[PDB]
């Protein structure tokens, strides 16, 4: 049933605009939980804000809305409608009543405007605040200058400035984010045309007392940019500023010294440079209010200090160790490119906001449609069974807050499943929740007989699916295929056909007693092993090579250990990263080692998750890398497990290859190098980490009485 | 140097004291961040306030500041002022206008009370409201009533009502957490003498529709309870309504039909209430302000619901799955035992909500101060050398703010490490990090050679401490002690000395390379082993009992998976949990296994925060038990530290047991079943995991070209 109906106005004061809030302003009936998040973009261009718009402003959001998975063009379903009105080209020609004359006119403002949200865009001005006198009826506004008059915490949005309008930012221009410390410990750059006075003699008492490189100027080289009264005005140019950032272990933001100015558009562009080549912005004073705050934990990536403790920020700069501030610089680059730094981001995150606040779930990502090619086939005891799905929409949403805006991948979209669901406490399963679990000895547990008929672990029972590619070998994989005949808990084959030319007509594939669905591949390319195919219906996902020879032993007790270990790849060929102590760069080694950094995906588990992942979330740059040399989806795939995770793979058993044992150059081996240095270029920083042990079954080489067996017999 | 001081004033407007915020209205002079943070708390017995307080909450209040280690009796060093001034006996003798000429005369009031704290606890009374016609100068309010034009954001504090002053919580009466499933899906008692009409008729169709269990009365079956305008008045006395919480997997807390009445002591105890017995509240109404709502993310804990979606409710509440509703029960559990049980409870969190607002650490955790025995001995290459301490006193205060607060074991101790500190990308050391880091090769890694050579992994070197418990067995500690010599990376073994009787004069102590620190005990526990020791100068304690035998390579290997898996017991000795079915209960369980849950203490790694935590944090009924049994000390730390991880041990090597090989009852086995049966009571749910797998070195039994070397030998 729909939710209840807010009861419109039938003009309102000051005072009852001031009030607005999603619990009196907001009409819920427009947006049942279920029914989607559609939302209706006004033309801007039919209004007149269009021919006012800053030109690159209006481009770049209207390329955005167009491409919008949300974005419908029908009014009558839709749950949020968009106006962009800013910014304005300057002088600012439009008066303000009139602005709001022509909100008040939009086609579907109705008597109030209840469910709209006024998005103004900065990118060139730091002096505009067009909505200031403007009545807003029942509309939120996203922008990025507020007075304490005007915002409605909760409501409102303070957002980032547009900067790349038109333009993509350049990650390859954006220095590495270690070493942690850069050549100045702070800077700041400003004019101002309270706590001021001290701050300014704190400041340059530090730089003067020269126990820190430090560069702090109160005054611009020349004609400081226009500000609101008592801002710090920036100096210079976008490219003049980021130079120094560049340099810059920490950036000093100073807030305005009108304390009733939340956030301005000079303030947030401070952030956004500081943020978008590394330096860990040091805010003065906390009645700032930061983009995004309502979802961001931004202590996390900024030190916030209340400007009487100025007098401490020196000691506090030098006392955060390497670890912490490295983190500090991961978490802003995460911020800064999930939630500022396009108008594609600016735009989802705006969606996201309300769309999270009213409590409805993310559009589900994209899956890879597969074209089947239907083939002919040659000549436990349960049928194959998929995962379910969808079982997190709310929780994931809603109750998973915090980790959804805070943690990689961010709030975006909606999986079918992931690696991260809570496990039951282990009495579960025995008062109430046992579906699907099946418990070693019944829950007595016991030795390698009883071990082999239960699954047993922290979860109920699933299957998992291999995923072979294929290209111009097609004696050798009727052969691997064979090899999978009896295979415990396998639910079916995916074999991505990656070959230009399809599979003969005459072809009898073997007939292994689960399906072997065969896809067609738009293209060739190594990537297509980690597409979500639509046929693979498990979380799990045995990634194997077309020529990779596993046992049955080995295979499951590899599924055993991702069972217990669903977000990391958990695998059979391990190797490392090497430094090349005289280039100081990276190295890939597959030497017998006694610490690892990688499991192949050429014979590993992982979660269907990460090929969502890798496919449409992860840098296009990297795709484009495996493609060029046709080389490195295996260490592509580790970099972004242990992105995610900060942890490890999983290596199991005693093998080193896995190629059979008949079975068999150097530009490659050195393409290993190049993309490895590469990656860590795309992400700032090298992911991966070490790890100095593997997994084995619990009594592998265990002397057991005559009443007891070993879990496996070889491993 | 000082934080500036705020400007005092020299009668201020009610808008001028609704604008207070830490910005504008605290004195950060007081509050250096490395002076502690000194806490003066007035006697309410010298004041008006003392003879109208209610007398349970006056004595429990004095009794918690009186035990508290932040308070001093030095008011001209406090940086917090803290009054009780609630609530009152009812009827109300004091006028308000009165009440705010004793708060202007109290001693340290200055001129407007800036750095203050009114605090004004409910227990009784649901229409108190004491301070809305009072003036409160520059002072903080915290209390569990407020109405719109009271309430200062980020400034005042929202608490929790008073419920158990003068008793303590019995969590025995607490039902189990698990099944997740209750009688009733939800439930709701109330009577009220906008959206209130729609709510009654949504949830009294579900009812009627018989879909499923439910309980919800809107009249009481006597006299509600005395309430604020617009209010569901509880209804019959606290134990009548926990019978049905209990019984109930939600409950709902409709707020107030005013929704200027932000939050009430009558809604706080229906929060207060569900959170004690594991109902999920589910909160009808977003504009509510809930306990500690700054620093608690409690759609965690809570369904937080607009009264709109009132027609969505039971959807909701079908479509959540068993392990997230699970999940939600524990974070209440933990959230309602931190932060609302007690005095104590509600004390320690206003102070640290302050504390943590205005960026001062923790008091340090305490410790065991040694009483060295000393003694005289009988007859790499470096010295020892101790762990850093106290790295990161602001990151875990501030930037951690989210797992300080929402994580156990919460935010009231600092500690001097932990095992959760963030790991530096695997570049780093080589690019101006590296102090104590020993790449393997140098970075380029190798095998077994270059492996013993350098500890590797992805943290700076460090060393462990040997922690041996003995009583009446000095002739097996004397041999124990000698197989010590020559272990590398020892950096002292601490002797807990439990025997009544002293080591004899005559005594010759080997002489091992390290010092041997023999510490007495004020009493003879098992819960001795895991003090954490003043001497103890490390992270990594290595816990054996006085007659394990283990080699130094076993014990090396250990050691270098523990420091990479820096949270977990990481150990020789695994154990199992086993269901007894016909019982429905556990059982203890040691034989040869295949799947493992425990590693047992008598030999093994874990961190040093553990000690602190099973000492000082962990409840006392558990160390009782262990009195009383004279057992399961490594059963209780297994409990702990799978509780705060959520994740299983990890079992180094095959060896099953670990005493000497010529080395040797019932109801000593079977205490142990009661022990583990008896945790879960105190926990509210099993919190042990099962895994399938041991960790063995990566060349383990692993074939190698003759240029290589295994990792170890046998291992
Ligand atoms: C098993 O383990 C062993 C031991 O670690 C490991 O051997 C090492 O292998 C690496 C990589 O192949 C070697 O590093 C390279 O050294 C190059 C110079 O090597 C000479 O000198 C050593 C002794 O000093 C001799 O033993 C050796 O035989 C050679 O005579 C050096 O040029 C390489 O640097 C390339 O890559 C880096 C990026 O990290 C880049 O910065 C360099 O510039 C260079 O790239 C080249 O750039 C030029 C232009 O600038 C361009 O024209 C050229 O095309 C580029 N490409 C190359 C390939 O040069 C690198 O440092 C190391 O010496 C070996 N050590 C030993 C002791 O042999 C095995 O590789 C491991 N096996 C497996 C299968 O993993
Ligand atoms: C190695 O692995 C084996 C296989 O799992 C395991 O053997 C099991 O051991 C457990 C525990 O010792 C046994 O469970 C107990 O069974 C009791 C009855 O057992 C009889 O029946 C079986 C066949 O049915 C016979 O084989 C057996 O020899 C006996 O004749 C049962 O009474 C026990 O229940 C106690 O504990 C639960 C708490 O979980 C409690 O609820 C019960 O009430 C009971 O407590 C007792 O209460 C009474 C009063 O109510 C009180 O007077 C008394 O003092 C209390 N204490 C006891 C001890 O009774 C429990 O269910 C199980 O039968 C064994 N299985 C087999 C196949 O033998 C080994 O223990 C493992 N070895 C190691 C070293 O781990
Ligand atoms: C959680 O979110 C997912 C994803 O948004 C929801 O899945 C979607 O559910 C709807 C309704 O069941 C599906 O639409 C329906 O499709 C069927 C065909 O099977 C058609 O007959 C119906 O008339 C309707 O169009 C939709 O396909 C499905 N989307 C996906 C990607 O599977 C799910 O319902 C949500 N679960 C909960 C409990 O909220
Ligand atoms: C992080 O917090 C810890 C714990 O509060 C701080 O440690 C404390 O530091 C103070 C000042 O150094 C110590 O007091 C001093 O003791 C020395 C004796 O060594 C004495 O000579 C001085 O006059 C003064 O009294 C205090 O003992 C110490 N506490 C503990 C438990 O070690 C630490 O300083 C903080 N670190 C940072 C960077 O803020």
Same mark, same amino acid.
């Given at each position: 049933?729909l !939710?209840?109906r ?7 004061? !000051? #005072?009852?605009?001031?009030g ?10 427009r947006?049942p939980?279920?029914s989607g998040?559609?939302?209706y973009?006004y ?5 007149? $804000?269009?021919?006012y ?20 063009e029908?009014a ?5 409608y968009?106006?962009?009105?800013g910014?304005?080209q ?9 602005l709001?004359? %022509?909100?008040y ?6 008597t109030?405007g ?5 998005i ?11 909505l200031?006198?403007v009545?807003?009826?029942?509309? =939120?506004?996203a922008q990025?200058t ?6 409605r915490?909760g409501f409102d ?7 790349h309008? @038109?333009?993509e930012?350049?990650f390859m221009?954006?220095?590495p984010?270690?070493?942690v410390?850069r050549?100045?410990l ?10 001021? /006075?001290?701050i300014?003699a ?8 020269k126990?820190?490189?430090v560069?702090?100027?109160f ?14 005005? &920036? ?19 100073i ?14 562009t401070?952030? $956004?440079e ?14 700032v %209010?930061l983009?995004?705050?309502?979802? &961001? %934990? ?7 200090? !209340? ?9 506090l700069l ?6 912490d501030?490295?983190?500090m610089?991961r ?12 108008? /594609?981001?600016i ?15 993310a559009? +589900? ?7 089947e090619?239907?083939?002919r086939?040659?000549?436990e005891?349960?049928?194959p069974?998929?995962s379910?799905r969808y079982?997190?929409?709310?929780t994931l949403?809603?109750?998973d807050f ?7 991948p ?10 991260? /669901? ?19 000895g019944?829950?007595?547990?016991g030795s ?8 047993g672990?922290?979860? +109920? ?26 295979? !415990? ?27 072997? @669905? ?5 293209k ?8 979500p195919?639509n ?20 295979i @499951?007790?590899? $599924?055993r250990?991702?069972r217990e ?6 695998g059979? +060929? ?5 430094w090349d102590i005289?280039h100081?760069?990276?190295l ?12 192949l ?14 496919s ?8 484009? @890398?495996?493609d ?8 592509? =795939? ?5 992105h ?16 059979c044992?008949?079975?068999?150059? /150097?530009?490659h081996?050195?393409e290993?190098?190049?993309?490895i ?11 991966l ?10 009594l ?9 067996? #070993? ?5």
């Amino acid at each position: 049933s729909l !939710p209840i109906r807010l009861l419109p106005e039938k003009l309102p004061p !000051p #005072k009852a605009t001031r009030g607005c809030r999603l619990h009196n302003c907001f009409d819920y009936s427009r947006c049942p939980l279920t029914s989607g998040f559609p939302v209706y973009v006004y033309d801007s261009d039919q209004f007149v $804000f269009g021919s006012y718009l800053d030109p690159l402003v209006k481009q770049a959001f209207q390329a955005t809305a167009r491409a919008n998975v949300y974005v419908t063009e029908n009014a009558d379903i839709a749950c949020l409608y968009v106006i962009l009105v800013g910014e304005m080209q300057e002088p600012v020609v439009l008066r303000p009543a009139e602005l709001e004359k %022509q909100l008040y006119s939009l086609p579907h403002w109705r008597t109030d405007g209840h469910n709209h949200v006024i998005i103004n865009l900065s990118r060139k001005s730091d002096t505009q605040n067009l909505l200031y006198n403007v009545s807003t009826g029942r509309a =939120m506004v996203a922008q990025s200058t507020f007075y304490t008059v005007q915002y409605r915490p909760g409501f409102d949005l303070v957002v980032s400035p547009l900067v790349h309008a @038109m333009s993509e930012p350049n990650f390859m221009e954006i220095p590495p984010q270690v070493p942690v410390k850069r050549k100045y410990l702070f800077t700041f750059q400003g004019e101002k045309i309270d706590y001021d /006075d001290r701050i300014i003699a704190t400041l340059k008492a530090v730089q003067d007392s020269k126990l820190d490189q430090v560069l702090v100027e109160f005054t611009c080289k020349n004609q400081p940019k226009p500000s609101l009264p008592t801002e710090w005005a &920036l100096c210079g140019e976008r490219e003049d500023r980021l130079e120094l950032l560049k340099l810059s272990t920490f950036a000093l933001i100073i807030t305005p010294g009108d304390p009733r100015l939340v956030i301005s558009s000079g303030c947030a562009t401070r952030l $956004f440079e500081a943020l978008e080549v590394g330096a860990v912005p040091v805010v003065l004073g906390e009645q700032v %209010q930061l983009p995004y705050q309502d979802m &961001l %934990q931004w202590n996390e990536a900024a030190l916030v200090v !209340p400007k009487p403790r100025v007098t401490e920020v020196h000691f506090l700069l030098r006392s955060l160790s390497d670890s912490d501030l490295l983190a500090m610089r991961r978490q802003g680059r995460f911020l800064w490119e999930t939630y500022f730094s396009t108008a /594609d981001s600016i735009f989802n995150t705006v969606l996201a906001m309300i769309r999270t606040r009213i409590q409805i779930p993310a559009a +589900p990502i994209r899956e890879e449609a597969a074209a089947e090619i239907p083939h002919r086939s040659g000549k436990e005891t349960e049928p194959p069974y998929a995962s379910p799905r969808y079982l997190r929409n709310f929780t994931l949403t809603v109750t998973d807050f915090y980790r959804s805006w805070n943690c990689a991948p961010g709030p975006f979209h909606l999986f079918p499943h992931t690696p991260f /669901d809570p496990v039951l406490p282990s009495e579960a399963k025995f008062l109430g929740s046992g579906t699907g679990f099946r418990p070693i000895g019944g829950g007595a547990g016991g030795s390698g007989k009883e071990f082999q008929a239960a699954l047993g672990g922290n979860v +109920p029972r699933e299957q998992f699916t291999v995923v072979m590619l294929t290209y111009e070998r097609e004696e050798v994989l009727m052969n691997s295929l064979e090899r999978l005949n009896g295979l !415990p808990y396998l639910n079916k084959v995916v074999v991505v056909w990656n070959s230009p030319k399809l599979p003969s007509e005459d072809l009898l594939w073997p007939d292994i007693g689960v399906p072997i @669905m065969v896809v067609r591949t738009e293209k060739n390319s190594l990537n297509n092993r980690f597409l979500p195919w639509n046929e693979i219906e498990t979380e799990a996902i045995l990634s194997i090579d077309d020529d990779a020879h596993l046992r049955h032993d080995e295979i @499951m007790f590899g $599924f055993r250990v991702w069972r217990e270990a669903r977000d990391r790849i958990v695998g059979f +060929p391990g190797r490392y990263h090497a430094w090349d102590i005289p280039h100081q760069s990276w190295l890939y080694n597959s030497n017998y080692s006694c610490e690892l950094s990688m499991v192949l995906t050429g014979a590993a588990f992982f979660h269907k998750y990460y090929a969502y992942l890798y496919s449409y979330v992860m840098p296009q740059a990297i795709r484009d @890398m495996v493609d060029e040399y046709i080389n490195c989806e295996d260490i592509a =795939m580790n970099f972004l497990v242990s992105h995610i995770t900060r942890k490890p793979p999983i290596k199991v058993t005693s093998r080193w290859t896995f190629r059979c044992p008949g079975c068999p150059d /150097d530009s490659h081996f050195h393409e290993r190098h190049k993309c490895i240095n590469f990656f860590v270029k795309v992400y700032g920083y090298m992911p991966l980490l070490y790890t100095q042990f593997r997994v084995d079954s619990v009594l592998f080489k265990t002397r057991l009485p005559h009443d007891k067996t #070993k879990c496996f017999k070889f491993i």
